[PDB]
Amino acid sequence: SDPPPRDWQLEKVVELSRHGIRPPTAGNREAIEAATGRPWTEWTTHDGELTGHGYAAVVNKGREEGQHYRQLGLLQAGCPTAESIYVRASPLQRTRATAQALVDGAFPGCGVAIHYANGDADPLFQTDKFAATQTDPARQLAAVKEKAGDLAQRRQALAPTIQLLKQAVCQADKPCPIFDTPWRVEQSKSGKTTISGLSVMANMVETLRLGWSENLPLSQLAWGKIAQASQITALLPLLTENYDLSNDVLYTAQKRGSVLLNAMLDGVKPEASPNVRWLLLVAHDTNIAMVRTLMNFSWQLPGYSRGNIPPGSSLVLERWRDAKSGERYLRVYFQAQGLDDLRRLQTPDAQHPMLRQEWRQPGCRQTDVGTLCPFQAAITALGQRIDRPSAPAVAMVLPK
Amino acid sequence: DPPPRDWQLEKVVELSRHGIRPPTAGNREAIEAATGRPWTEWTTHDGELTGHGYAAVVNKGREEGQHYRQLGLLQAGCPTAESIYVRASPLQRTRATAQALVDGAFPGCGVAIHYANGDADPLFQTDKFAATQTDPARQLAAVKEKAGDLAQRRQALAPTIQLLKQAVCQADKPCPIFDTPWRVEQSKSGKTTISGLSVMANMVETLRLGWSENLPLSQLAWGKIAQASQITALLPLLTENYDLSNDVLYTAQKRGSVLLNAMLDGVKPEASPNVRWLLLVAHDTNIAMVRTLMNFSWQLPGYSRGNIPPGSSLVLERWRDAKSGERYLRVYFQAQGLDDLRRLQTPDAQHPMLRQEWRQPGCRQTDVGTLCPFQAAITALGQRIDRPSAPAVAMVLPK
Amino acid sequence: SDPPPRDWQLEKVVELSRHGIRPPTAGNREAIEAATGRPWTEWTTHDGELTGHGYAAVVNKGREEGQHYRQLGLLQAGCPTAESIYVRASPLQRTRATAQALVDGAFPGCGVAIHYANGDADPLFQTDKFAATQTDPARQLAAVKEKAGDLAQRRQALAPTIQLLKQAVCQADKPCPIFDTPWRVEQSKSGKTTISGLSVMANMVETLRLGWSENLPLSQLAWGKIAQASQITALLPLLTENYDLSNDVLYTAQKRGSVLLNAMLDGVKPEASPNVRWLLLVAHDTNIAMVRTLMNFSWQLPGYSRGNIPPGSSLVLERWRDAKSGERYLRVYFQAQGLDDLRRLQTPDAQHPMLRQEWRQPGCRQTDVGTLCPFQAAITALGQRIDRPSAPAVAMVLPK
Amino acid sequence: DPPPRDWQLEKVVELSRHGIRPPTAGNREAIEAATGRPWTEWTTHDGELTGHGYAAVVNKGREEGQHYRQLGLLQAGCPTAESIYVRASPLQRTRATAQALVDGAFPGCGVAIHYANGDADPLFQTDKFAATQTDPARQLAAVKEKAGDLAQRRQALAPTIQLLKQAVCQADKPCPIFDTPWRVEQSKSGKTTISGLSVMANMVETLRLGWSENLPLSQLAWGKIAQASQITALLPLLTENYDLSNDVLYTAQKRGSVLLNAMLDGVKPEASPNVRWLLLVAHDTNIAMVRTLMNFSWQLPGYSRGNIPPGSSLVLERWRDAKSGERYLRVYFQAQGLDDLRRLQTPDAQHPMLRQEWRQPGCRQTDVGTLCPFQAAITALGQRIDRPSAPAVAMVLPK
Ligand SMILES: [Mg+2]
Ligand code: NA
Ligand code: NA
Ligand code: NA
Ligand code: NA
Ligand code: NA
């Protein structure tokens, strides 16, 4: 490495990470097995929990990240103190274990603890469980229908991708129910709004992507039908489509993601509590999608479709200072590993770097540390779509 | 006086312990009763392979794959059916460890592992098969005979017991286990244990595993243990318990002969399956019985005599000198150190695996390690095998 | 450690180190053996070369120093580049080997090279070998006599210390010539000005101090007569006195030290060549004494007399920046290890820290990183006594 | 089946190599002639102990002192006349290494070392004493007999020779040594060498020492060598040369018997001097002859068979079980790894010394290592000693 930058100084990191690789959730399994009329692989990890390979991949990212932040002088050599980091994970096993993996890698052998809510609902993450942040089913129905438009036309436009999925998952000369169902907007008794057909197809594509990333034997991924990363990439358009029509619907993102984006923007400002160098939040792709929608931030990384959120990927806000003037800037980016890098447990070292895309707007400047945006203007732009009634203050430090 | 050599590695037979787990459900009940307090609940289910445990096993498997490619045992790239066969005990923790090993050794290659359909593999769960079960009266006598004066044994380990008590007992509260005399105990199903000692051994294994896991110190032993040397100081209790259980010769003969026999058969030419690397993944109890039958033990840095760390393994290597055509066996045990496990250090050139080799007269020092004339080595290693307890198994399972 | 400072940023280090522990020089030995009428211990190291124990002690300081500068974010993690450091050593073996020891410690296993002049004279260090920087014997005679004043009175005032030295080094009922010689100003045929009696006594005290620091057996240090560090400390007043009347004479320091102080002050300024994070110069106590005299900087560290310069000790200038404004400051200090720490090869970790004294003047402020002085005013004050004709520009990067 | 034990370490006898040196003057002449080019001039005089070498030895001695205090062999604080006696070969490099060891082991204690007044110590410079010199005709025959077909030996090491040539030869220039057939050569004073091989061995030792020294890569092998594995790959040439010189049994018997005899006598009770630790500091040639008489060799991570790194040592430990009163011998060789030396890594719990133990039938694994019944061990270790070449020496020198 070259010596660390002096003219630019990193002050604060706020990071929102997805959990690492998991098998399908119990609900996902029910759906995909019904959709294809056959059982899918049972993994060595319990459905919905972080797999060992998932933990290992997250450690690899955390290790390179900790080295990077020591190199830049944000963190101390050796083990951290309370001033170094605060980790808040969604209370699910998969997110707690992912949070452990990140600090396990970033601070080798340091026994760094994580924090999570006592109950099974954290108001930053399980926003459908709190009055201020719940959607109204009637509004969500309208919103999804408005964005979806002609669903027959969307289904026809995805026909080639649907065909690739069918080839991978359907048994020769057997019923494959899901490919016969027309795409329509449906609501559950709890008022969750999904698209018939597409939503379960999206569950299938995520499961295949996760199985690829896991390094499952090919015989156990899609019955030997998928053998290269490009074949996963070709399926991802269905997942993007489902996201466009669920988590990335503005109404839904405003109701269910405003509290988290608000917490993140406040967290990157000076005078944040807790007073730490790195605030690390670990949650779900749902949360990341809603936040990036409110940010109006879109990405497309090599080997992935638009907006894809891989396991152990993260959205980062960094506050930087021009040391020649004290003027503050924000850097905003999304990072992930590629499909084969995850499968191979490749460390994201200098030669196989993380995939990354930075947000920008007029007035941002390209520096040796990344794209830096005047701080207040960046905060204002990123926060425009926040629904204030849906963004109550949350104490970041869990009482614990 | 070594002759001209052209060393070629022909076959590896490896018996690995599973990686790091939290206490088993049974362990937890015993240790929580023994100390009168709850112990940390890990993010991994009791008895399963932890994420950190998986990561540490990947690291070992990655360097091992590189090594055996460098030696020409394994071809470049992904393996074939002739490269490797992996058989794991059917428990989640052993299945998951088997996966981690080939995940590291053959990056991104989707290498499968194999395990029994039921809850019992006749190589590993040997107490579930008549031919390989101990007789209760014979086992009781063997354990009594080896234990001798247990009051003296307990008094001899007093400093170690005190260190354990300091770590796990609450000030000004009862701590039941430390008040129990050590006595032989035998269950209705025939399992012989030592009262006091055996539960203390469970406690020490739990603390060693929690250290190796990189648990926060507050959740390891309530902040009382902060360095690896404090774990090392407790391990004599684990060695003592092993001496009086898995390492009792009679027990090892009944419950371990089938596995050692299978390993010695696997390392000979014409083995089924025909693979360059036979990888077996099981439990410390299995390794302990096997090494006892071999009359082989070890002492590695930071560990007590015969300690079997998570992800450690016993290895048999068959070597040929391509010039003379003579064949040799190399036998060793390998593990990572305490801090290396805690830190997820990959075992590279600067941080090598800890290793000790077996030898007997006739063995020679070579550029590839201690190599022993093959026939004499297999014969010597099999001398303690109890023939009626060694039925031949099919190594390749159904699928 | 706590996280590195953000409001204060270290930009540049310029360091002038003494060589590490050596046996007496060949000249020293001749003098001290004549002075006491007996042979002194022959060390395992050649006279005047860096001892192995000396190298080890210097490595210990370099190792903690490299860790410190990575912690503060001046240096990169891992091995350095050309931008990290430039090391220029006096061409003597003792100074080359000391320079190697410092980077050996600071950058473990990195094979960092050092630089030194092809000949046996470097114009920053062997200043008596270059026309612009040589003293005139007639002026030096006047200068030493002026400062020395009544030498009989100085000798009488040091009588208790002289007695302690006699006790350590003189044989019972044998001639010890040096203690009979009156103190007078003398000049050699080359025009070097020394004080008779005192100068050789100072040679003796340095040799004893170095033998203590070396961990020589007590039987080989002063024939068993010195057994604790306090006994070395008690002798050091003679060394301070000799320094006051040689290297610390203003005239001499101006002629022979201006070129080096000038190079050092220019080196800590922005726009210095070479463009490096750390300029490390390795030379002799003579050079350090002249420089601190020109700086008007005096120190007294625990266990040492005023101005003492221990083996492997150094004078440091650091340029710091207030990251809230870009305003620049200078920190100036002298550092060493204590006598027992050197003898024991103690690493100067957090629990046995380097002994240090900082320079200051009105306007300096105490910060969490040390005493910081407004940069231009500090440069001006430190440079007041430079004799400009004696301070020619020197290319810092050796052609080489 | 171990009995109750209370292990007490009673005596250590240690034979250490000197630490890192540059090439000797003689080495430099040979290697510069062999490659037709000047080699780096170090800041240390040819053949002397380097500053880095001193520092690395201090590190080892520091951890060793701590260890032997922890075991109760050495009292707390500074030693007494009964704690240690240090005898070094009279060369600067060995005297300086002896100092470094006690400098580390007993911080700030002014511990003295001892050496012969002349240029020859009868334990170490054995060729300078009639009883312990080889006969020229017998030595020539022994070396010829072991060497056999040297053309085959040279052809067998061709890949290694090529790696050396790539590191040290200038492109498009003559490199004399690589064009010489390997032949037995005997000087007028009786010294037997192998043409080609012996100078290549000098080159490999120089490169290994330069690596260990932390020389800039540009000054090591003109930038051609950048990692430890490249040094490891060259070491077979050093092993080959040792096999045909210091490790020839006849040679070792004549020139090594006096030293092994003194070591075995020193490790027995009632030794003179009465000290807890007898420390001898000499040369790789001495260690090689001693281990050959012991029929003991090793292979440590990153090193070829029997390699003797700078600051490495052979150790004999006499242990007593305080319960039974039985006595045991433990025998091992220890060294630091290549990167550890280069980096001046202290050998702490996380970076332990590399070690291999000797054993024979009857030895047992214990909590303090491989321990061998004392009388049987000393007898077995002394079996190859040539009695006429083993006069008794006074261990304590005049001063
Ligand atoms: Mg290390
Ligand atoms: Na840093
Ligand atoms: Na689209
Ligand atoms: Na659990
Ligand atoms: Na004075
Ligand atoms: Na030299």
Q: SS3 sequence, B279-336?
A: EEEECHHHHHHHHHHHCCCCCCCCCCCCCCCCCCEEEEEEEEECCCCCEEEEEEEEEC
Chain-chain contact of B51 with A112 (C-beta, under 8 angstroms)? no
Please provide the size of chain D in residues: 399
Q: How far apart are CA A29 and CA A39, in angstroms?
A: 9
- Distance from the alpha carbon of residue A92 to the mean position of ligand 4, in angstroms: 12
Which chains are adjacent to chain C, needing at least 3 Cβ pairs under 8 Å? A, D
Alpha carbon distance D254, D389 (integer Å): 6
User: Quick check: D241 and D196 in contact, CB under 8 A?
Assistant: no
In one-letter notation, the amino acid at residue A386 is: I
Gap from B373 CA to chain D (nearest CA, Å):
16
Looking at all shown ligands, the one closest to residue B24's CA atom is 4
Residues paired with B356 in a beta bridge? B333
Sort out which chain C residues have CB atoms less than 8 A from D49's CB and list them. 52
- Say which residue the tokens 């009175």 belong to: C153
C55/D55 Cβ within 8 A: yes
Q: What angle do CA B217, B219, B222 make, to 5 degrees?
A: 75
Decide the pairing of beta strands C278-283 and C85-89. Answer: parallel
Q: What is each CA distance from D107 to B152, B336, D59, D277, in whole angstroms?
A: 40, 32, 11, 16
- What are the chain D neighbours of B354 within 8 Å (beta carbons)? 352
Q: Which domain holds residue B116?
A: 1-399
d(CA B358, CA B368): 14
3-state secondary structure of B40: coil
The DSSP result for A123-137, as a single string, is TTT-GGGSGGGPPPH
* CATH number where D234 lies: 3.40.50.1240
Tell me what percent of chain D is helix, strand and coil, each rounded to the nearest 5: 40, 15, 45
CA distance B282 to A15: 40
Is D92–C343 a contact, with Cβ atoms under 8 angstroms apart? no
Q: Which residues contact D266 (CB under 8 A, 6 or more apart)?
A: D11, D13, D278, D316, D395
What whole-number distance in Å separates Cα of residue B94 and Cα of residue B90? 7
For residue A326, with 0-12 CB atoms within 10 Å meaning exposed, 13-18 middle and 19 or more buried, which class applies? middle
Q: How far off is chain C from A178, nearest CA to CA, in Å?
A: 54
Contact C109, D214 (CB under 8 A): yes
C contact set with D (CB within 8 A): 44-46, 50-56, 59, 63, 93, 96-97, 100-101, 104-105, 108-113, 215-221, 340, 343-346
Any long-range contacts for C22-26 (C-beta under 8 Å, 24+ apart)? C22/C47, C22/C48, C22/C49, C22/C50, C22/C51, C22/C54, C22/C94, C22/C210, C22/C311, C23/C47, C23/C48, C23/C49, C23/C51, C23/C207, C23/C210, C24/C48, C24/C203, C24/C206, C24/C207, C24/C210
Q: Is B144 exposed, middle or buried (0-12, 13-18, 19+ CB in 10 A)?
A: middle
In 3D, which of D255, D280, D287, D283 has the Cα closest to residue D126?
A: D255
Are the beta carbons of D261 and D392 closer than 8 angstroms?
Answer: yes
Positive or negative: CA dihedral C362, C365, C371, C373: negative
Q: Give the span between the Cα atoms of B10 and A232, in whole angstroms.
A: 38
Instruction: Name residues with Cβ closer than 5 Å to ligand 4, which is an ion.
Output: B 41-42, 45
Chain B residues close to D228, C-beta within 8 Å:
349-350
From the annotation, which residues of D make up the binding site for Mg(2+)? 351
H or E stretch at B266: helix B249-267
| DSSP state, residue B114 | B
User: Cβ contacts (< 8 Å) between A43 and chain B: which residues?
Assistant: none
Q: Which of these, B329, B331, B330, lies nearest to B314 by C-alpha position?
A: B331
Distance of CA B8 to the CA centre of its chain: 27
Amino acid at B379: T
DSSP A45: S
Residue type, B176: P
In angstroms, how far apart are the furthest CA atoms of chain D? 71
Distance between CA atoms of residues D223 and D208, nearest Å: 14
Q: Which residues of A touch B214 (CB under 8 A)?
A: 104, 109-111
Which residue in chain D has the smallest CA separation from C55?
Answer: D51
Strand partners, B85: B278
Which burial class, exposed, middle or buried, applies to A200 when counting CB atoms under 10 A from its CB (0-12, 13-18, 19+)? buried
Six token digits for residue D281: 């500091």
Numbers of helices and strands, H then E, in chain C: 14, 10
- Residues on chain B touching D5 (C-beta within 8 angstroms): 156
Tell me which residue of B330, B305, B302 sits closest to B318, measured CA to CA.
Answer: B330
Residue A176 corresponds to which tokens in the numbers above?
């494959």
Q: Where are the alpha helices (DSSP H) in C249-352?
A: 250-268, 285-295, 339-343
Alpha-carbon distance C124 to C280, whole Å?
A: 13
Coil, helix or strand at residue A204:
helix
Question: What is the number of other CB atoms lying within 10 angstroms of the CB of residue D361?
Answer: 10
Residue C388 exposure: Cα atoms within 13 Å on the Cβ side: 1
Name the interface residues of B facing D (CB cutoff 8 Å): 1-2, 4-6, 146, 152-153, 156, 228-229, 236, 239, 243, 249, 297-299, 301-302, 304-306, 337-340, 349-352, 354, 359-361, 365-370
In one-letter notation, the amino acid at residue C396 is M
Nearest CA in chain C to A10: C6
**β-strand C328-336 against C314-322: which pairing, if any?**
antiparallel
Give the residue from C70, C84, C86, C276 with the most A CB atoms within 10 Å of its CB, the best one to mutate: C70
B306: left (phi over 0), alpha (psi -120 to 50) or beta: left
Question: Which ligand approaches the C-alpha of residue A245 most closely?
Answer: 3
Say which of A71, A76, A321 has its CB closest to residue C3.
Answer: A76
Select from A48, A54, A44, A51 the least CA-distant residue to A25: A48
Per the listing, tokens 């300078």 go with D128
Position B2: which residue type?
Answer: P
**At CA A107, angle to CA A102 and CA A109, rounded to 5?**
110
**Ligand 6 centroid to D44 CA: how many Å?**
5
Structure tokens belonging to residue A197: 């057909």
Q: Distances from the Cα of B160 to the Cαs of B178, B299, D72, D373, in angstroms? A: 12, 18, 17, 27
Contact D56, C105 (CB under 8 A): no
Distance CA A147, CA A245 (A): 7
State both tokens at A292: 């990036």
CA gap A327, A334 in Å, rounded = 24
Per the listing, tokens 């101005």 go with: C307
Q: HEC states along D200-269? A: HHHHHHHHHHHHHCCCCHHHHCCCCCCCHHHHHCCCHHHHHHHHCCCCCHHHHHHHHHHHHHHHHHHHCC
C-alpha distance from D48 to closest chain C C-alpha (Å): 9
B72: left (phi over 0), alpha (psi -120 to 50) or beta: left
Closest residue by Cα to residue B392 from B246, B264, B250, B253: B264
Looking at the DSSP bridge assignments, the partners of residue A8 are A322
Q: Which protein residues have their CB within 5 A of the ion that is ligand 2? A: A 70; C 70, 73
CB-based contacts of A324: which residues, under 8 Å, 6+ apart?
A: A7, C321, C326
Phi, psi of C230 (to 5 degrees): -60, -30
Which residues lie below 8 Å from residue D307, measured CB to CB, with a gap of 6+?
Answer: D235, D238, D239, D300, D335
DSSP state of D382: T
Asked if A58 and B43 count as a contact pair (C-beta separation under 8 A), the reply is: no
d(CA A50, CA A337): 17
CA distance C266 to A301: 48
Q: Which two tokens stand for residue D395?
A: 């261990």
- Residues in chain B, how many? 399
Contact by Cβ (8 Å): A208, A232: yes
Is residue C123 within 8 A of residue C133, CB to CB? The reply is yes
Long-range contacts of residues A160-163, Cβ cutoff 8 Å, at least 24 apart? A161/A234, A161/A235, A161/A237, A161/A238, A162/A201, A162/A238
CB distance C215 to C176 below 8 Å: no
Asked whether the beta carbons of C345 and D58 are under 8 A apart, the reply is yes
**The two structure tokens encoding residue A32:** 């995909």
Mention every residue, 6+ apart, whose C-beta is less than 8 A from residue B233.
Answer: B160, B163
Q: How far, in Å, are A162, A236, A237 from residue A306 at the CA level?
A: 17, 9, 8
CA–CA separation, A397 and B313 (whole Å): 44
Which of B51, B62, B99 comes nearest A55 by C-beta? B51
- Nearest residue to A170 (alpha-carbon basis) of A217, A220, A225: A225
* Separation between Cα atoms, residue B139 and residue B142, nearest integer Å: 5
- C187 sits in which H/E element: strand C185-187
* Cα A310–chain centre separation: 6
Pairwise CB contact (< 8 Å): A217 & B112: yes
Amino acid at B271: A
Contacts of C217 in chain D (CB under 8 A): 110-112
d(CA D142, CA D139): 5
Phi, then psi, of B373 in degrees rounded to 5: -40, 125
Give the span between the Cα atoms of C195 and C197, in whole angstroms.
6
Cα separation of C113 and D214, whole Å? 10
| Residues C84, C255: Cα–Cα separation, whole Å | 32
CA distance A297 to A382: 9
CB neighbourhood size of A150 (10 A): 10
How far from B334 is each of C315, D90, D304, D354, CA to CA, in Å? 50, 41, 19, 14
Q: CA of D225, closest CA in chain B: separation in Å?
A: 16
Q: Are C215 and C343 in contact (CB under 8 A)?
A: yes
- Please state whether beta strands D364-366 and D369-373 pair in parallel, antiparallel, or not at all (unpaired): antiparallel
**A with C: how many residue pairs have Cβ under 8 Å apart?**
74
Distance CA B36, CA B175 (A): 6
List the Cα angle B25/B31/B32 in 5-degree steps. Answer: 85
**Is residue C277 a contact partner of residue C75, using CB atoms and an 8 Å limit?**
yes
C283 touches C19 (CB < 8 A): yes
Interface of chain A against chain B, CB under 8 Å?
44-46, 50-56, 59, 63, 93, 96-97, 100-101, 104-105, 108-113, 215-221, 340, 343-346
What determination technique applies here?
A: X-ray
Whether D225 contacts D231, CB under 8 Å: yes
């719940």: which residue's tokens?
A134
Tokens, residue C299:
């120190």
Q: Which chain D residues touch B236 with a CB distance below 8 Å?
A: 367
Q: What are the φ/ψ torsions at residue A336 (nearest 5 degrees)?
A: -155, 165
Please enumerate in sequence order all residues whose Cβ is within 8 A of that of D237, keeping only pairs 6 or more positions apart, or say none. Answer: D157, D160, D161, D164, D197, D200, D201, D204
Contacts of B166 (CB under 8 A, 6+ apart): B224
Ligand 5 mean position, distance from CA A399 (Å): 63
Q: How far apart are CA C299 and CA B70, in angstroms?
A: 60
Residues of B annotated in the binding site for Mg(2+), as ranges?
A: 351
Cis upstream peptide for A137 (omega within 30°): no
Q: Please give the helix or strand (H or E) that residue D340 lies within, else none.
A: helix D338-343
Residue D308 contacts residue D288 (beta carbons within 8 Å): yes
Pairing of strands B277-282, B84-88: parallel
The DSSP output letter for A115 is: B
Q: Which residues contact D85 (CB under 8 A, 6 or more apart)?
A: D114, D273, D275, D277, D278, D279, D395, D396
For residue C282, give the H/E element and its range.
strand C278-283
3-state secondary structure of D72: coil
Query: CB A37: neighbour CB atoms within 10 A?
Result: 13
Residue among D310, D319, D360 at smallest CA distance from D11: D319
Q: How many CB atoms lie within 10 A of CB B270?
A: 6
The closest ligand to the CA of C242 turns out to be 5
Q: Which ligand is nearest to the CA of A3?
A: 2
Binding residues of A: 352
Shortest Cα–Cα distance, C310 to chain D (Å)? 17
Q: Give the C-alpha separation, C20 to C57, whole Å.
A: 8
Q: For D337, list phi and psi in degrees, rounded to 5.
A: -70, 165
Closest CA to C58 of C335, C260, C395, C397: C335
Chain D residues with CB-CB distance to B under 8 A? 1-2, 4-6, 146, 152-153, 156, 228-229, 236, 239, 243, 249, 297-299, 301-302, 304-306, 337-340, 349-352, 354, 359-361, 365-370
Residues from C in contact with A at Cβ < 8 Å: 1-4, 6, 9, 11, 67, 70-78, 80-81, 83-84, 277, 321-326
Q: Which among D243, D268, D239, D250 is positioned nearest to D384, based on CA atoms?
A: D250
Do B322 and B72 form a contact (C-beta atoms < 8 A)? no
Closest to D365 (Cβ–Cβ): which among B298, B352, B368?
B298
A274 cis-preceded (ω within 30 degrees of 0) = yes
Burial of D97 (0-12, 13-18, 19+ CB in 10 A): buried
Query: Rounded to whole angstroms, how far apart are CA atoms B102 and A131?
Result: 48
- Of the candidates C276, C290, C280, the one whose C-alpha atom is nearest the C-alpha of residue C312 is C280
Q: Which ligand is nearest to the CA of B39?
A: 4
Q: Is C352 annotated as a binding residue?
A: yes
Amino acid identity for residue C211 in this structure: G
| DSSP classification of residue C128 | G
Specify the number of domains making up chain B. 1
Contact partners of D by the rule of 3+ C-beta pairs under 8 A? B, C
**Residue B171 and residue B180: Cα distance in Å, rounded?**
18
**C to D CB pairs, distance under 8 Å:** 100
